[PDB]
């Protein structure tokens, strides 16, 4: 796209703020924006604020969210499709011109791990190239095993194609296969979906932690196979939702689009290597570290 | 095949007539039938009763099925494989010659949205060329949800390859993925795998409703990551079975053959694309849409 | 490799030995052996001792591993990763050099049915030339079906490539994917993943026994969409954990290294196929046969 060439917009923070007991303003950019996914490759990514995935957004069940998209692109439509949401999406996940913003509303009725993404025709090609994320909505009552839980993390799996490119998004594989880790707290890392952020910086932990992971699996196309080597799953929450209890599973099934809550206990100190069982997708990126110390 | 040039078999009705409180009779034929499966694309199927996937079959569980096949291609013996039922393969799921029948009998005993198929070697060359379809075993007892539940439809997914081409069917990826409707109800839509008809002729629904989808993937090779733009799923039963509840679900994995009953609410007037959140898939044609109005 | 030309070195039977009432030791191998995967096609397979999938290994829950690999192979190091247990990857999970022997311990304290495989860099290439197997963990309270099982086999399903080629590993589909039993009991057969075995050998039943299947996909790269023909699963338990009970399943979706217990009643004797509903890959070899006769 010609109107792309040598376009690299700086990273713009997620906008949010709470404006009732149950509404949520939430304010974010489309932009373009140059990310390295794999040492020596950068692709001029097609992203929300500059992320990709894109910034984490969490919630509260029962929120209605007041939705600003602001689209920095110069020649493309961009828009917002949030899973948590209950919306009309051939009114509320509609397109927003270059250099416009547009404002949707809708309630997040429903807990759990859910993928956003932009919604414009080809769909394909905006998710492919970079523009998607998860929302998180927390449970008004908690999961059953909050109690247990001592450290948690976000991870988002995606993959990556030759850029651009239609006929590889529909008939090849992945190039790159990755995982991401958005914050929920301060100090923890903020990364993009990239082959090495993850082995060289580990996620944190202390010996005997049980960990819980908000996860999801953006696809746009794989399915992924969740392990943590060295554990097993204690409690599974497919999608997030509280009521979707699992027990003792080695692999998180997630499709294309699919969240869960996982929780698992490090007994011991050393590196925990994070994959999808999928190793094809592992071997082409798909490894993230968790190092596990005595003190955390 | 040289004796399937220019053959192009009128649809021949679904017959089905119940002959006991637990006795069913149905009679379908395999016939080979031209189906455009995207606009000036014509693929000369291998079918039951001229539809692909097949005609909808409903029974009660507890039903036990009195199946006959009347074998219509010039040439290619075929079989039928009903997932519903407990059956000896090598004696009840045997091929029928061209120009003969047979009739086999057996319970459908488990409720659900069970896949049906041809059984005749290779199955991949005859699932793939369209012989697939559903059967729906109504539970004695129903869903917990039932008295919730507004309007219904049934959604089926399947793959398109090049033609007859067993190369292809083994090692390719799918042309095409697409949905189809089946009724349940008078004037319910009854269509076939097809990129278009869905988009063209949407589902149709009011707004606020609560709809149950009974769907399937049939394959014959990929995965489904079924999913509703714009709502969550309230409830799901994994293969329509009761028991296997699962709720607030954003996206239904459906294993090749696998099988739900979806329950989800649409909260304001508009279209609303069902989808494969397999984008790839989602691109090649496997995007339904459902038009909600003020009054259905 | 060049060490490996003209190497076949004989399988070796596992060792286990109980030494305490939770406490176990397990002996293999690491070892370079010829399989025969397809009628004519010898793969010189990276295998724990001399299998591949390599030898069953069944334990107590509550029991700890004592685990010894000695590693036969001439050049390449090896490791072994069991999912069932808790322990340190970087320091419980590693190398093993040629003719050296490594011990490790560590606990299997969760109830299932759990994927092993080699650790070793690059793991796709460990695990693609063979060196999968599975671990079941038996519950201390048992399955609540237990009493209505009247004969039980394992089955694994693994894929096979071009023989060492990590561009096909990663990028290419399938060349076979098969299934193989794994004994339990004097008498049961012990079989390799190859095409033809379980076709020709099929696995032995009486009319109107309800089987239980221990089952898992060790990949490296496929899910499973595992259905056993004529038959419905009345029962099952997700990664073999008795919480994770489904009912009335007419297929099981099995990520890569997934695993189930599922249980089903053959009803009339004949010949039932056990597949994967995949059909490309059932075409490709993922077809074995359960034999039910009037005696068993
Ligand atoms: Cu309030
Ligand atoms: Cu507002
Ligand atoms: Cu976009
Ligand atoms: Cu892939
Ligand atoms: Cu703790
Ligand atoms: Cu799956
Ligand atoms: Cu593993
Ligand atoms: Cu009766
Ligand atoms: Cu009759
Ligand atoms: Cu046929
Ligand atoms: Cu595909
Ligand atoms: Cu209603
Ligand atoms: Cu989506
Ligand atoms: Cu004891
Ligand atoms: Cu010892
Ligand atoms: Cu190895
Ligand atoms: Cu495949
Ligand atoms: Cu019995
Ligand atoms: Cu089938």
């Given at each position: 796209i010609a109107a792309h060439k040598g376009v690299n917009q700086a990273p713009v923070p997620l906008k949010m703020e709470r404006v009732g007991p149950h509404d949520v303003h939430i304010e974010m950019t489309a932009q373009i924006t140059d990310i390295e996914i794999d040492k020596g490759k950068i692709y001029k990514a097609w992203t929300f604020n500059g992320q990709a995935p894109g910034p984490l957004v969490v919630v509260n069940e029962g929120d209605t969210i007041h939705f600003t998209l602001k689209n920095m692109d110069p020649v493309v439509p961009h828009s917002m499709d949030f899973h948590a949401v209950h919306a009309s999406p051939s009114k509320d996940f509609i397109?927003?011109?270059?250099?416009?913003?547009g404002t949707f509303t809708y309630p997040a009725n429903k807990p759990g791990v859910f993928?956003?993404?932009?919604?414009?025709?080809?769909?394909?090609?905006?998710?492919?190239?970079?523009?998607?994320?998860?929302?998180?909505?927390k449970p008004k009552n908690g999961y059953?095993?909050?109690?247990?839980?001592?450290?948690?993390?976000?991870?988002?799996?995606?993959?990556?194609?030759?850029?651009?490119?239609?006929?590889?998004?529909?008939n090849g594989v992945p190039s790159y296969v990755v995982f991401s880790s958005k914050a929920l707290k301060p100090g923890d890392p903020n990364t993009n979906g990239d082959t090495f952020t993850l082995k060289e910086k580990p996620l944190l932990a202390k010996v005997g932690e049980k960990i819980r992971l908000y996860i999801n699996?953006?696809?746009?196309?794989?399915?992924?196979?969740?392990?943590?080597?060295?554990?097993?799953?204690?409690?599974?929450?497919?999608?997030?939702?509280?009521?979707?209890?699992?027990?003792?599973?080695?692999?998180?099934?997630?499709?294309?689009?699919?969240?869960?809550?996982?929780?698992?206990?490090?007994?011991?100190?050393?590196?925990?290597?994070?994959?999808?069982?999928?190793?094809?997708?592992?071997?082409?990126?798909?490894?993230?570290?968790?190092?596990?110390?005595?003190?955390?």
């Open positions: 397109d927003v011109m270059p250099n416009k913003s993928m956003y993404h932009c919604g414009t025709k080809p769909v394909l090609q905006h998710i492919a190239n970079g523009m998607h994320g998860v929302i998180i909505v059953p095993t909050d109690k247990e839980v001592d450290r948690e993390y976000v991870l988002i799996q995606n993959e990556w194609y030759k850029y651009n490119d239609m006929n590889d998004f529909q699996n953006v696809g746009p196309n794989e399915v992924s196979s969740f392990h943590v080597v060295g554990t097993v799953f204690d409690d599974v929450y497919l999608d997030g939702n509280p009521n979707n209890h699992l027990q003792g599973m080695q692999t998180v099934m997630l499709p294309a689009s699919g969240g869960a809550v996982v929780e698992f206990t490090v007994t011991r100190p050393g590196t925990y290597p994070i994959v999808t069982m999928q190793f094809n997708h592992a071997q082409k990126g798909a490894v993230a570290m968790l190092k596990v110390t005595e003190t955390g």
